[PDB]
């Protein structure tokens, strides 16, 4: 019976392929709701 835990053998010379990568996943939803996080782009004046 194993409590599901282990530890990566993260060593300096040893790990290639079996090496540590730091991973960041950005998730977002878009064009379906009000928005608060936005591109650098600048507004124009609004013409009717």
């Amino acid at each position: 019976c194993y409590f599901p835990l282990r530890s990566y053998g993260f060593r300096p010379t040893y790990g290639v392929g079996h090496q540590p990568y730091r991973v960041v996943v950005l998730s977002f939803e878009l064009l379906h709701a009000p928005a608060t996080v936005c591109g650098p782009k600048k507004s124009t004046n609004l013409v009717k």
């Binding site: 053998g9 040893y14 392929g17 079996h18």
Partner: protein, 48 residues
């Protein structure tokens, strides 16, 4: 399911049980028996 099932067996001292694992070095794993970093397989043992 598997294509190429191979099975290996011998006698060791409890001092050497850790030496059977991939990347571990010590005079048994140096000069008697060793296995590749992507070893797709399992170790099993008992006292005798």
């Amino acid at each position: 399911c598997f294509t190429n099932v191979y099975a290996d067996s011998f006698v060791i001292r409890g001092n050497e049980v850790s030496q059977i694992a991939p990347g571990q070095t010590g005079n048994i794993a140096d000069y008697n028996y060793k296995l590749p970093d992507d070893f797709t397989g399992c170790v099993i043992a008992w006292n005798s």
